[PDB]
Design an enzyme around this catalytic site. Structure first.
Site, PDB file in Angstrom:
ATOM      1  CB  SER A 294       1.160  31.611  -8.205  1.00 40.74           C
ATOM      2  OG  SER A 294       0.240  31.075  -7.204  1.00 40.74           O
TER       3      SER A 294
ATOM      4  CB  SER B 211       2.753  28.276  -6.449  1.00 42.65           C
ATOM      5  OG  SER B 211       3.243  28.476  -7.763  1.00 42.65           O
TER       6      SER B 211
ATOM      7  CB  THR C  52       2.724  27.953 -13.307  1.00 37.35           C
ATOM      8  OG1 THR C  52       3.204  27.569 -12.012  1.00 37.35           O
ATOM      9  CG2 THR C  52       3.477  27.182 -14.383  1.00 37.35           C
TER      10      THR C  52
ATOM     11  CG  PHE D 140      -4.813  27.134 -10.834  1.00 37.53           C
ATOM     12  CD1 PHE D 140      -5.863  27.346 -11.711  1.00 37.53           C
ATOM     13  CD2 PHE D 140      -4.953  26.166  -9.852  1.00 37.53           C
ATOM     14  CE1 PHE D 140      -7.037  26.620 -11.598  1.00 37.53           C
ATOM     15  CE2 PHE D 140      -6.121  25.436  -9.736  1.00 37.53           C
ATOM     16  CZ  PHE D 140      -7.164  25.663 -10.610  1.00 37.53           C
TER      17      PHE D 140
ATOM     18  NE  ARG E 276      -0.066  25.685 -15.204  1.00 40.82           N
ATOM     19  CZ  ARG E 276      -0.150  25.783 -13.884  1.00 40.82           C
ATOM     20  NH1 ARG E 276      -0.825  26.787 -13.341  1.00 40.82           N
ATOM     21  NH2 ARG E 276       0.441  24.884 -13.110  1.00 40.82           N
TER      22      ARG E 276
HETATM   23  B1  LIG Z   1      -0.698  30.128  -7.517  1.00 41.74           B
HETATM   24  O1  LIG Z   1      -1.561  30.661  -8.445  1.00 41.74           O
HETATM   25  O2  LIG Z   1      -0.007  29.112  -8.102  1.00 41.74           O
HETATM   26  C1  LIG Z   1      -0.458  27.739  -7.825  1.00 41.74           C
HETATM   27  C2  LIG Z   1      -0.359  26.788  -8.814  1.00 41.74           C
HETATM   28  C3  LIG Z   1       0.215  27.226 -10.163  1.00 41.74           C
HETATM   29  O3  LIG Z   1       1.419  27.548 -10.252  1.00 41.74           O
HETATM   30  O4  LIG Z   1      -0.529  27.285 -11.179  1.00 41.74           O
HETATM   31  C4  LIG Z   1      -0.782  25.474  -8.562  1.00 41.74           C
HETATM   32  C5  LIG Z   1      -1.300  25.133  -7.296  1.00 41.74           C
HETATM   33  C6  LIG Z   1      -1.396  26.101  -6.288  1.00 41.74           C
HETATM   34  C7  LIG Z   1      -0.965  27.389  -6.548  1.00 41.74           C
HETATM   35  C8  LIG Z   1      -1.042  28.535  -5.493  1.00 41.74           C
HETATM   36  C9  LIG Z   1      -1.530  29.767  -6.214  1.00 41.74           C
HETATM   37  N1  LIG Z   1      -2.938  29.457  -6.593  1.00 41.74           N
HETATM   38  C10 LIG Z   1      -3.983  29.369  -5.539  1.00 41.74           C
HETATM   39  O5  LIG Z   1      -3.690  29.554  -4.397  1.00 41.74           O
HETATM   40  C11 LIG Z   1      -5.451  29.022  -5.915  1.00 41.74           C
HETATM   41  C12 LIG Z   1      -5.912  27.713  -5.269  1.00 41.74           C
HETATM   42  C13 LIG Z   1      -4.725  26.703  -5.218  1.00 41.74           C
HETATM   43  C14 LIG Z   1      -5.144  25.286  -4.804  1.00 41.74           C
HETATM   44  C15 LIG Z   1      -6.376  24.765  -5.560  1.00 41.74           C
HETATM   45  N2  LIG Z   1      -6.820  23.539  -4.881  1.00 41.74           N
HETATM   46  C16 LIG Z   1      -7.705  22.713  -5.780  1.00 41.74           C
HETATM   47  C17 LIG Z   1      -8.682  21.917  -4.929  1.00 41.74           C
HETATM   48  N3  LIG Z   1      -8.098  20.652  -4.527  1.00 41.74           N
HETATM   49  C18 LIG Z   1      -7.545  25.779  -5.581  1.00 41.74           C
HETATM   50  C19 LIG Z   1      -7.105  27.176  -6.062  1.00 41.74           C
HETATM   51 CL   LIG Z   2       1.335  22.435 -15.415  1.00 47.61          CL
HETATM   52 CL   LIG Z   3      -3.998  21.871  -7.982  1.00 46.29          CL
END
Ligand SMILES: *[B@@]1([O])OC2=C(C([O])=O)[C]=[C][C]=C2[C][C]1[N]C(=O)[C][C]1[C][C][C]([N][C][C][N])[C][C]1
Ligand SMILES: [Cl-]
Ligand SMILES: [Cl-]
Ligand SMILES: *[B@@]1([O])OC2=C(C([O])=O)[C]=[C][C]=C2[C][C]1[N]C(=O)[C][C]1[C][C][C]([N][C][C][N])[C][C]1
Ligand SMILES: [Cl-]
Ligand SMILES: [Cl-]
Ligand SMILES: [Cl-]
Ligand SMILES: [Cl-]
Ligand SMILES: [Cl-]
Ligand SMILES: [Cl-]
Ligand SMILES: [Cl-]
Ligand SMILES: [Cl-]
Ligand SMILES: [Cl-]
Ligand SMILES: [Cl-]
EC number: 3.5.2.6
Lengths: 246, 245
Positions: A49, A97, A188, A190, A232
Site C-alpha cells: 500500500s 489503504s 503504511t 502490508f 512497523r
Molecule cells: B496495504 O498494504 O495497506 C494495508 C494495511 C497497511 O497500511 O499496512 C493494512 C490493512 C490492509 C491494507 C491494504 C493493503 N494490503 C493488502 O491488501 C494485503 C492484505 C490486506 C488484508 C489482510 N487481511 C488479514 C486477514 N484477516 C491480508 C493482506
Molecule cells: Cl500500525
Molecule cells: Cl489487518
C-alpha cells in the site's frame, strides 16, 4: 542521497522485539543517510500500500482523479475490510489503504501510462507485470527502502514529473501527526502474512519536518502474523525518538 | 445564508465566566450555528489569525519565494524566545512569529495589501495604523462569521490566489492529525486590553472528517493571560459534545 552509513546501535530496537527488518533515516540538510543494515536497505520488496503514493499522483496527473475533493462512492457490494465500505475522499482512501479504490484508479490509468510514470519516477524495478490492478500487491513490482527515501525526497521537493499542484495534493493527504514542534507525513504498507518460510513485508515510510530540517525515513520488516503490525511504527518511532527527532 | 442560535452551548461559556462566541458550520457557511447571534457578526481585531491571509498574500506577491523558504533570524533580540531562530513558513505560523510577518507586510506594501483584502472580503478591510501592525493594534476588524466564510473559500481553493499557494498555506495550518479527522486551525491573541476594554483571543479553523467538513470560529474577551487556554478548551468541548472531535 549523498552518503549512507551503517549504525548497528539501532539493532537493539529490532532484537528487543525479535524483528528482522531495516530502517533508513536521511537528513536532508547534509544529504546523508543512516541504516541498521546496508544489505537489507537495498533489498527490494513488494511496496504494497506504499504504492498508493505514486498511484495517487499518477491518478491526479492523468485526470482519473479530479481533485482532492472527489468523493469515491461505495457501490454497496462487499469489500475485504469493513473500514472500506463507505464513501471516501482521496485522503480517506489513503488513510485506510482502500485497495479497491486504487485498483479502479490503476485500471483507468492503464498499463501504458502507469509504465511511463514509474520510469519517470524511477520507482523500484518498474515491473508492473501480473495484472494492472494487482502488480503492487501480488505482482513483480519491487522497491527498496533506499529507493523509497529517494522517491519521497523528490515528492517533498516537488521534483517529481508531475505538477506541483498535484504533488501538493498528495502531500496534504499523507499528514499523519501534527505537533507544535514537528510534522509527520507517512504511509503504511502490508503485503500479508506470506507463505511458509516466505513471510510477507510490512512498511512504514514518510518524512518528518522539524524546525528547519527534514528527515526522510523508510522502514520494512518481515511479518508472518497480523498482530506484529504495530512494530512497523513503534520500532522506527523509538529510533527517531533516540535521535531527538520525535 | 442564515445564522441560527444554539442555546445549549452557553453552558460551556458560563461555567468559565467567559464572554465570547463560537460559530460552527457543517458542509458550508450557508447555515451556521452559534451561541450568540449578535457577537457572531461583531468584528474584532484579528490578531495572529491574520497570518493566514498575510501568508497567502506573501506567496501571491512573491515576497515569500516558495513553500520551502527559511526565514533567517538576524540574531538580534525578538520579543519571544521561540521567535529567535530560523523558521519555515509553518514554523513561523505555529509559533506566531510576529517579526517574520511584519517584514512580509512591509514588503507587500499597503497598496497590494489593500487590493488582496478587498479580493478576500476580509472584514472591514481597514489596514490603517501602520503596515507592520494594523492587525495587532490598528483598525482592521473581522467577525467570527467572516472568518468562517474566508476559511471556506480557502478550503475550496476559491480565494483569489493560485491553488498551489492556497495548498501551501493549508499544509502550514494543520494542527491535529488523527485517522478519523484532520484539523486545520490558527490561534490569535491581541493582548490583555485596556481598562474596561479587554483584548480578544481567537481560535479559527476547520475539521475534515469522513466526507464532511466543519468550519469553526471562536473569540472571547480576555484581560488576563491565564484565561488563554479557554479559547481552545471551550470550542473543543463543544465540538466533542457534538461528536465532531
Ligand atoms: B496495504 O498494504 O495497506 C494495508 C494495511 C497497511 O497500511 O499496512 C493494512 C490493512 C490492509 C491494507 C491494504 C493493503 N494490503 C493488502 O491488501 C494485503 C492484505 C490486506 C488484508 C489482510 N487481511 C488479514 C486477514 N484477516 C491480508 C493482506
Ligand atoms: Cl500500525
Ligand atoms: Cl489487518
Ligand atoms: B498573535 O496574535 O498570536 C500570538 C499568540 C496566539 O497564538 O494567540 C500567543 C502569543 C503571542 C502571539 C503573537 C501575536 N499576538 C501579539 O503579538 C500580541 C501580544 C500577545 C502576547 C501578550 N502578552 C502575553 C504575556 N505572555 C501581549 C500582546
Ligand atoms: Cl537526503
Ligand atoms: Cl533485491
Ligand atoms: Cl516481497
Ligand atoms: Cl475489496
Ligand atoms: Cl514544523
Ligand atoms: Cl454541527
Ligand atoms: Cl477589538
Ligand atoms: Cl519582535
Ligand atoms: Cl502568551
Ligand atoms: Cl492555547
Amino acid at each position: 542521497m549523498g552518503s549512507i552509513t551503517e549504525n548497528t546501535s539501532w539493532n537493539k530496537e529490532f532484537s528487543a522485539e525479535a524483528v528482522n527488518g531495516v530502517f533508513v533515516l536521511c537528513k536532508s540538510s547534509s544529504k546523508s543517510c543512516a541504516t541498521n543494515d546496508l544489505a537489507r536497505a537495498s533489498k527490494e520488496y513488494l511496496p504494497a500500500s506504499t504504492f498508493k503514493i505514486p498511484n495517487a499522483i499518477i491518478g491526479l496527473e492523468t485526470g482519473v482523479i479530479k481533485n482532492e475533493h472527489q468523493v469515491f462512492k461505495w457501490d454497496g457490494k462487499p469489500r475485504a475490510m469493513k473500514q472500506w465500505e463507505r464513501d471516501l475522499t482521496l485522503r480517506g482512501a489513503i488513510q485506510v489503504s482502500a485497495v479497491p479504490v486504487f485498483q479502479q484508479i490503476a485500471r483507468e490509468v492503464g498499463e501504458v501510462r502507469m509504465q511511463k510514470y514509474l520510469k519517470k519516477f524511477s520507482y523500484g524495478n518498474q515491473n508492473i507485470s501480473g495484472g494492472i490492478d494487482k502488480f503492487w500487491l501480488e505482482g513483480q513490482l519491487r522497491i527498496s527502502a533506499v529507493n523509497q527515501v529517494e522517491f519521497l525526497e523528490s515528492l517533498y521537493l516537488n521534483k517529481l514529473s508531475a505538477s506541483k499542484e498535484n504533488q501538493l495534493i498528495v502531500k496534504e493527504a499523507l499528514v499523519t501527526e501534527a505537533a507544535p514542534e514537528y510534522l509527520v507525513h507517512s504511509k503504511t504498507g502490508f503485503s500479508g502474512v506470506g507463505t511458509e518460510s516466505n513471510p510477507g513485508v510490512a512498511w512504514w515510510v514518510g518524512w518528518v519536518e522539524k524546525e528547519t530540517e527534514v528527515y526522510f525515513f523508510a522502514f520494512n520488516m518481515d511479518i508472518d502474523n497480523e498482530s506484529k503490525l504495530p512494530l512497523r511504527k513503534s520500532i522506527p518511532t523509538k529510533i527517531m525518538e533516540s535521535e531527538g527527532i520525535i
